[PDB]
Design an enzyme around this catalytic site. Structure first.
Site, short mmCIF file in Angstrom:
data_model
loop_
_atom_site.label_atom_id
_atom_site.label_comp_id
_atom_site.label_asym_id
_atom_site.label_seq_id
_atom_site.Cartn_x
_atom_site.Cartn_y
_atom_site.Cartn_z
N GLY A 99 0.82 -1.19 0.00
CA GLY A 99 0.00 0.00 0.00
C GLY A 99 0.86 1.25 0.00
N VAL B 6 1.99 -6.23 2.98
CA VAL B 6 1.59 -7.53 3.52
C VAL B 6 2.48 -8.61 2.92
CG1 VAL B 6 -0.23 -9.27 3.63
CG2 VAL B 6 -0.75 -6.87 4.08
N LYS C 1 1.15 -8.09 8.09
CA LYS C 1 1.18 -6.68 7.71
C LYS C 1 2.17 -5.93 8.58
CE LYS C 1 -1.68 -2.77 6.35
NZ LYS C 1 -3.05 -2.22 6.08
N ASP D 21 -12.45 2.78 2.18
CA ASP D 21 -11.61 2.34 1.06
C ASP D 21 -12.20 1.09 0.42
OD1 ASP D 21 -9.48 2.61 -0.73
OD2 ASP D 21 -7.99 1.73 0.62
N1 LIG Z 1 -7.03 -6.75 0.77
C1 LIG Z 1 -6.16 -6.09 0.46
C2 LIG Z 1 -5.07 -5.24 -0.01
C3 LIG Z 1 -3.85 -5.41 0.89
C4 LIG Z 1 -2.77 -4.48 0.36
C5 LIG Z 1 -3.22 -3.03 0.59
C6 LIG Z 1 -2.32 -2.41 1.75
C7 LIG Z 1 -1.38 -3.61 2.22
C8 LIG Z 1 -1.45 -4.64 1.13
N2 LIG Z 1 -3.47 -6.82 0.73
C9 LIG Z 1 -3.78 -7.83 1.57
C10 LIG Z 1 -3.28 -8.99 1.03
C11 LIG Z 1 -3.44 -10.35 1.60
N3 LIG Z 1 -3.25 -11.32 0.71
C12 LIG Z 1 -3.43 -12.60 1.14
N4 LIG Z 1 -3.81 -12.99 2.34
C13 LIG Z 1 -4.02 -12.00 3.25
N5 LIG Z 1 -4.41 -12.08 4.54
C14 LIG Z 1 -4.49 -10.83 5.04
C15 LIG Z 1 -4.16 -9.95 4.04
C16 LIG Z 1 -3.87 -10.69 2.92
C17 LIG Z 1 -2.70 -8.68 -0.17
N6 LIG Z 1 -2.81 -7.36 -0.37
#
Ligand SMILES: N#CC[C@H](C1CCCC1)n1cc(-c2ncnc3[nH]ccc23)cn1
Length: 287
Positions: free
Chosen positions: A16, A21, A40, A132
């Site tokens: 982000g 993450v 995260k 969002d």
């Molecule tokens: N939803 C959403 C978007 C978020 C992004 C946006 C800000 C940090 C990364 N993100 C979470 C993941 C993610 N992918 C796979 N398993 C997960 N578990 C918790 C978050 C997560 C991948 N991108």
């Protein structure tokens, strides 16, 4: 809850503007047999960003819902606060829908729509504003289940008002968020309408909200004037078009979510009921 030493990085999943993450392996038995988790962390661990991240963690831990990504725990050693959550292997709905679009019929899109609506209904019961809601922040667990996957902008409503006044995803914003920086359940409903548009365009990029709005506004604009002409466009009832193949009743729900009058927008409870009724009728309850 979690111990830093056992956590092993494997791959980045998403980035982000302030956090990323990671896919990691948590292995308390040191036998590499442990669960794979999503982690995260902050890109820049400033005092401001850490205070925001702490409240985000508190928000997620307070949420327990089938369609909200599962909080697991926190991890730290000294300023290395990390949030541990269940790993969803199909990733964001954007990637999933792009890869599988030919296999995802409208009845399946409405299944995802219903799940998002019920997650948001649940959020509303805690007086949380997501701020969002977009397919980039929806994750796919399996072919039959999606979860709201990120809460980095989520706010708790104050006790004296039904809105929170607070780099913004402007093409998903309600007009009062653009003009007054006011966020509310009703502005989340507006954004949900954009999510519905994203789903029924199958996340095609040439049809995305930014591409459509910039064609309506003019590509000569940049930054601030984009926001100005978007506000004027919405005030004059310019709206994203009905996606190809989208049933008129589904487009009608989008347009009700996009009402300039905040009071006229539907509730998430009513959206979930109507989407469920449409889906059942489409599958053969009415034909
Ligand atoms: N939803 C959403 C978007 C978020 C992004 C946006 C800000 C940090 C990364 N993100 C979470 C993941 C993610 N992918 C796979 N398993 C997960 N578990 C918790 C978050 C997560 C991948 N991108």
């Amino acid at each position: 809850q979690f111990e830093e030493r056992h956590l092993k990085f494997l791959q980045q999943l998403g980035k982000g503007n302030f956090g990323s993450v990671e896919m990691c392996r948590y292995d308390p038995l040191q036998d590499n047999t442990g669960e794979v988790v999503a982690v995260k962390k902050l890109q820049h661990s400033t005092e401001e960003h850490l205070r925001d991240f702490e409240r985000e963690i508190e928000i997620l831990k307070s949420l327990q819902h089938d369609n909200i990504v599962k909080y697991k725990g926190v991890c730290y050693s000294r300023r290395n606060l990390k949030l541990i959550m269940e790993y969803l292997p199909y990733g964001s709905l954007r990637d999933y829908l792009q890869k599988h679009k030919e296999r995802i019929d409208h009845i399946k899109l409405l299944q995802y729509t219903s799940q998002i609506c019920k997650g948001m209904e649940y959020l509303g019961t805690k007086r949380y504003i997501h701020r969002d809601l977009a397919t980039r922040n929806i994750l796919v667990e399996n072919e039959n289940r999606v979860k709201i996957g990120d809460f980095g902008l989520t706010k708790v409503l104050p006790q004296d008002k039904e809105y929170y006044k607070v780099e913004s995803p402007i093409f998903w914003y309600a007009p009062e968020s653009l003009t007054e920086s006011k966020f509310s359940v009703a502005s989340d409903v507006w954004s949900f309408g954009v999510v519905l548009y994203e789903l029924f365009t199958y996340i095609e990029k040439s049809k995305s909200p930014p591409a459509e709005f910039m064609r309506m506004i003019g590509n000569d604009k940049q930054g601030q004037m984009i926001v100005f002409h978007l506000i004027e466009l919405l005030k004059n009832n310019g709206r994203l078009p009905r996606p190809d193949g989208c049933p008129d009743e589904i487009y009608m729900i989008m347009t009700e979510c996009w009402n300039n009058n905040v009071n006229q927008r539907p509730s998430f409870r009513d959206l979930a009921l109507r989407v469920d009724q449409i889906r059942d009728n489409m599958a053969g309850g009415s034909g």
